[PDB]
From a paper:
In this study, we determined the crystal structure of an arylsulfatase from Enterococcus faecium (EfAS), revealing a homotetrameric assembly with a windmill-like architecture not observed in other known arylsulfatases or phosphonoester hydrolases. Arylsulfatases, a subset of sulfatases, catalyze the hydrolysis of aryl sulfate esters to produce aryl compounds and inorganic sulfate. Functional assays and site-directed mutagenesis showed that EfAS hydrolyzes sulfates, phosphates, and phosphonates, indicating broad substrate specificity.
The crystal structure of EfAS was determined at 1.96  Å resolution in the P4212 space group, with two crystallographically independent molecules in the asymmetric unit. Structural analysis revealed that EfAS forms a homotetramer through symmetry-related operations, comprising four identical subunits arranged around a central fourfold rotational axis—resembling a windmill assembly. The formation of the homotetramer is primarily mediated by interactions between loops and α-helices of adjacent subunits, involving multiple hydrogen bonds, salt bridges, and hydrophobic interactions. The catalytic center of EfAS is located within a groove on the protein’s surface, positioned near the interface between two adjacent subunits. EfAS exhibits a characteristic AP superfamily α/β-fold structure, featuring two β-sheet domains: an N-terminal six-stranded (β1–β6) and a C-terminal four-stranded (β7–β10) β-sheet, encompassed by ten α-helices (α1–α10). In our crystal structure, C61 displays dual conformations: unmodified C61 with its –SH group coordinating Mn²+, and HFG61 covalently bound to sulfate, forming a sulfate-ester intermediate (FGS), likely resulting from crystallization in the presence of p-nitrophenyl sulfate. Structural analysis reveals distinctive features of EfAS within the AS/PMH superfamily. The substrate-binding pocket of EfAS exhibits an elongated and narrow shape, delineated by residues S60, Y82, L132, H133, N174, R323, and K324, which form the outer boundary of the pocket.
Author numbering:
A (entry chain B), B (entry chain B), C (entry chain B): 10 to 487
D (entry chain A): 9 to 488
């Protein structure tokens, strides 16, 4: 009795960009809606350190950021992990495959996958004309090589002029059939065709979208340009500061012209609805292989996107737009006997690894994350009450504690604080830190932060108190 | 210590078609906005003789129109200049390259560029079936040859029926990847790949757009057709005359149906937003070559476009639509220590040459233009108070003086005058010449014009006074 | 001194579908507008027998319908004419060429053209699987052969399902560059390239459009679908009868759903604006060959299209929609010394032949049509006051007299009459025949009809009076 | 004013006797080169003193002797710190300068006086390492390889048929003939003529990578030689060669091939040369289309020869005629040089091209080691050299030699062995004369010349006025 596993990873998808989680239901995600509502949808799933590299180290190893050391974004840091999610499945006799984005270093280090067909998207560390030929450009991306075999050697990832950290958006400029999202599913179907029939499979399907460039196929772009509402709400509350400058094309903060905000949403949502159709394609193929009833699917995003919310862009922030991720288990064969329903407790990306090994392999994994199995059966025994996350981001480096009621944030280089009522202010528009009615929570929350940060090399804590630090103390890896 | 230089030239782009300079902010130029606002934006930059050939002679040589003799448009006039912008950089050890439009004569005369990959757009003097094979059609344009290699030998520049001096507009009829704007950036990236690594580079990227034909890719055309405002303001004031005829398809004056005015703007703005994305592509490539921090970029247009304003089309007029050009230095490596800000003083296209040689090479150039270096540091010492420009245009030949307060225009074949308050009437809608309250300015302004024109071969001045001349006296080259 | 001549023929274009002639100015024909307004525009030009074959026999020979015998539509009738328009030019030393639609029989009979590159559109008599191979389908049309060489042998003229006599419409389903309208201009440019340089040319450029199928390129179709006015006026007056049935897809009469009427107009107008751009392409090429100033251009349509007006479709009717045609001389080299202006007198398609031979060759042609030369110089000496036209159309066979004030119509199989005031009722909405105030005109008009029809084989006249005839008496050729 | 254009045509690894005009048996088909060489000035005794690619191309471009440049053997990625080069002097004098094809310089895209270089160096190991810089490797190092990927698809590469660039193996080109690198050089030379600056004269280097291996000419030319090469192929084995009797390495420096392999190698090599010959004719026809056939001077040269199995030796880097003697001629159909056209028998070095062209065309001196051949063209031998000192590092077979108009004297300093050949009566070097005492006087003089050239060299060839054996670790390819 060994079920197959498909781990579907998308990059930079917000939790509220799953229509089921959304409040306004504008985004079209009919396939993911069905999957999440029919399985176990994690309504409170979080990427504690919300950017590509630290989130993916956490996904693969189950490790908290202090254990792995990945407290912010840094490329080309060694991945010295043996006990990884695909490695444990391999040890138990699975064929292990990854199609798409790994974002590990060295880029083709397999970390337990038998075989990897790699496309990390646009990575500056793989697109330098003076670095090693075999590790750069079309030799670093099997999708880009496919693009050159398909469109000719002159084709490249940047042909339409959109930057991978930019809010600029416009439709995919080539035939739709060559889009990277289709390619992941096409190659996932090729894996099903060509896999070893004598063993079960663990397959990671890892889409680089909806991470920019924001270039969905024209159909999906025009869909949203035609129907997005007239006014687009940025959830501007009582704490945001506008610097009143023309936005950098790769801005981390600021405000767009309304037309630019509209195009950004149409690109971003368009990429998501496109992923949704292509995942449905993969589901249809699973059925052609008679694997629709013996396979368990977990969908997750590595982190969110601020998308202009609070005058912020990109990620690496403590706010919900960055840290809250969509996440659900889809179990159409009913291999998990727990009653299917939405899960409210605080789940971390670190929990996926031990949950999958427990639920599918019936084994314990010694790591920081914890198996959600008991949550599925309605038992919050031993479950965390809070999450400590953080991210290095220069002046805007953050440290935060999230509970089911509060989010307490500290910016240690600025030495400023925020407090939000997550139940009544889910979009974090009302900073409460300066209201004396919350003096008790704030003192308790500061006390818990000392608990997490005492002893950290950056010097956050001196003599049991939180102290402003200089920007030179911030590191992305411990 | 030798920074690289990229000189980006566009053709027929209005100063107010850079969104940053625009008042209504309708045009989408997010990349150029960022570049101009982050560097030094010249808010008062002018092409004194506003058409292709005299402006480009001024750009390349720094010479005033009396010195070069190019007082209007004329093709196939010798370019007997040795002291040119690329030549000085070559002398100081730079590799010099031009991709795109030169508009010199002979067409492939290099004037200091080591290598030129040429595309002048549609030029009547290069598209005559009875002129030399090697200098005509696809042998005159390396872009057109690319088009024939890409689409087949039957492809040509006029396939969709749009004329290069016409207000008619419609989307590019072929796949977007073959557009001439993409080709300039593709070939600029090929130059970066293949350049001599032992020396710095001076690269001119010279787009033929947004000069007509007005055929942007469909995406950009539809963008504006969908969102341009309902009513399009032509700034019709108290002096324009409407001749009440069906407009010639290559008209120099008149009025369009509202739908034709809308399509013209959608074509023109669409070409500009397309250039903007493609420049962003080139910026991304500069970073892949690790040249994003050791390169100085100057963006400029050779002249503007009347675009229907004042019932005028094309260029060669004294009005702001023709003479005011977008122009800025982008310095992301902070190689220039002056505080970055907008520059208000009167800058001419003649100033680019000596400014670049001063700022980058630390040398003096003996020419008519002057280095803007001191302006960047806040010092208007020795700066001009006024510009004398002109253009031959038959009956509408003009002579004008522009200061920071006034524009005084004389049409010497018509022997009529205009006066505009540039501060309070920036769109030149209120001719003041017949108001007696301005008798003193007008007399002074006429006196200055005698100063500029006394001795000119056309006979503008007889016995110290300005006199009407016959049309046969007008010349385009002295 | 021999000017070149280009005769541009379009098929089924209404006179009021030239924007200059139109009242509402909705249709976009900027190139034709300029040509017609700058030359001599014939505001009252008529195809007396308004369908393809009889109009083209009249165009080529100058003969009235009684002389040629072509009083209605009939295919495969011999063309036993020696004295034709191209033949006279050939005799005077011209190279003669036709590109496009001839509609003669045998199809490749040249009738004075040195060379013909043929595309008659969809012709039922050339699309029969049991008729001669060499004269059918792709062997009858050099455009269709081009389509098979371009798209593959499976391509055909009917691939999108639109019928050549149908009001159904939709965009061209293939790449725009393969449209038949582009092909005429491409092949007209090939003729200019390859012509005999030692002699002048007479070139007929004969477009099959805007005759259905109504499949313009997508750009032009969407243009009108987006901007045509909400309500489309059919000019329904006091005489039309609605048969209240679902319209045949090739209906000669009836009423369409509003959406179908909108799509028909968007297809029809779209084809016309497309022709307009492609004619501008040909004008640009004429200039590349230095023939823009030594060439005289005459534009004409063979007949109109009812387009749903008066609950009528197609042509072959006596009403203005069918009989009034656009027609103008374009003379940018000013080879004709007459002052350029619009021409109001009644001109027939029979007049083109003798006008061109008189104006360009300085010779008399013995035919029924008359040279318009004196009209251009303001002299209506000897000019007709009236036109007698007609068409065989079963029950709706017609006979009519048109003057500058009246149109009098007789339907001899129905034996009904109509009378319209052409000055005050230009759209023929008020039948006056039953108003006693017009008894004198009507009696005179009936008397003139006896004059035209006495002796005709059909038996219209018996003992000096007009008499109802049976449908079996109607013929299309005498 | 009225300055002539110049085309320097360089081929790689072509033997002097693989020009039919120079050959004894006239088997190889080079009709176009025969015409140009016999109608112009053919250098019958032109030499590459250090016969491998990099030292010969340094000598060609700079005019420097191997001791001045330090290039005494093959070595990649040595800096080219030369300002005074052949294209630079023409550029300085107002010429547009262009190279299409093989430069073999370092860094690969250093222009060294060319306004523009369209680069194809052939197969170079230092340009084909997956761990070296992307923009300098494989299809980013070779504009021909990029053209092949654009033409055949990204799958295509330079080694698809399995032939090694240092190998005697041969077979026809496996792709359509129109994509061959020899055609590409001429196609792009025509593109340059189309797009050049019309206001200045041009200096154009057309640098073919062939007939250097892979030995893969188009099928037509391969079959031509397989169908008609003689049954017996002479290796010119004399009284001094020694066979090692091992299976030959596919990139062997010495040995003996099976008959069929030797025949295939000749068919590939000759086939490549006859193919170049047709493609150069193509270029001549294009020159006339641009009306430049009578205002252009052409100099054809090879950088060094190829042993081709002769004396049981392969490749190059040897002191024998197969390696050091190169075809070389000036073609001047416009009669821009007034000297009567004839063949030139005196000793000419590859170092002489640079000063000769600058003298003949520009009327200037260059301060280099080579000398202008102009006086020879006019029949004046006054002061012209009577000997050449050459050498090459090649491990145990490292050589030092003196070539005069009559003798070649060779010293192998690691083996401490000597050879002497009569170049008039024994032009194929089959009879070593060193051990015959009749020649002791000549040998004495030749050793004394070598002492003069080699005194003070860092390798320690000379001690107390005498040539002495050196250890192999003393051998270097570039002097310090
Ligand atoms: Mn990510
Ligand atoms: Mn211009
Ligand atoms: Mn017709
Ligand atoms: Mn070589």
């Amino acid at each position: 009795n060994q079920p197959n596993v498909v781990l579907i990873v998308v990059d930079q998808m917000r939790a509220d960009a799953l229509s089921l989680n959304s409040q306004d239901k504008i985004i079209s995600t009919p396939t993911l809606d069905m999957m999440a509502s029919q399985g176990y949808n994690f309504e409170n799933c979080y990427s504690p350190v919300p950017s590509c590299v630290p989130a993916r180290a956490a996904l693969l190893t189950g490790l908290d950021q202090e254990t792995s050391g990945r407290v912010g974004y840094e490329d080309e840091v060694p991945w010295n992990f043996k006990n990884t999610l695909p490695e444990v499945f391999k040890e138990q006799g699975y064929q292990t495959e990854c199609i798409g984005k790994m974002h590990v270093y060295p880029s083709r280090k397999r970390l337990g996958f038998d075989h990897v067909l790699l496309h990390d998207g646009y990575l500056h560390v793989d697109r330098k004309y003076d670095k090693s030929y075999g590790e750069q450009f079309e030799y670093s991306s099997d999708y880009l090589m496919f693009l050159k075999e398909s469109l000719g050697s002159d084709a490249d990832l940047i042909d339409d002029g959109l930057n991978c950290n930019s809010w600029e958006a416009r439709p995919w400029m080539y035939p739709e059939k060559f889009h990277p999202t289709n390619w992941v599913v096409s190659e996932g179907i090729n894996f099903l065709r060509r896999k070893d029939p004598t063993v079960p499979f663990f397959l990671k399907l890892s889409f680089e979208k909806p991470h920019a460039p924001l270039n969905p196929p024209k159909y999906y772009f025009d869909m949203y340009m035609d129907r997005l509402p007239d006014t687009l709400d940025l959830h501007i509350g009582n704490w945001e500061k506008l610097e009143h400058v023309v936005p950098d094309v790769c801005a981390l903060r600021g405000r767009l012209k309304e037309d630019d905000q509209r195009r950004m949403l149409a690109g971003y949502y368009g990429l998501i609805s496109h992923i949704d159709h292509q995942i449905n394609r993969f589901l249809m193929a699973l059925k052609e292989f008679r694997h629709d009833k013996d396979t368990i699917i977990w969908f997750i995003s590595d982190h969110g996107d601020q998308l202009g919310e609070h005058y912020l862009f990109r990620k690496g922030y403590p706010y919900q737009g960055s840290i809250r991720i969509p996440s659900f288990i889809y179990d159409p064969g009913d291999l998990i006997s727990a009653k299917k329903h939405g899960i409210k407790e605080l789940v971390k990306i670190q929990d996926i690894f031990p949950s999958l090994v427990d639920l599918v392999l019936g084994q314990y994994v010694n790591t920081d994350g914890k198996s959600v199995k008991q949550l599925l059966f309605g038992n919050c025994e031993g479950w965390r009450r809070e999450i400590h996350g953080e991210h290095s981001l220069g002046l805007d480096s953050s440290q935060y504690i999230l509970t089911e009621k509060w989010k307490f944030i500290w910016f240690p280089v600025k030495n400023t604080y925020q407090l939000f009522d997550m139940i009544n202010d889910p979009n974090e528009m009302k900073n409460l830190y300066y209201d004396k009615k919350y003096e008790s929570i704030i003192y308790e929350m500061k006390h818990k932060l000392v608990g997490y940060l005492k002893g950290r090399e950056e010097g956050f804590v001196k003599n049991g108190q939180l102290i402003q630090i200089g920007i030179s103390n911030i590191v992305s890896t411990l």
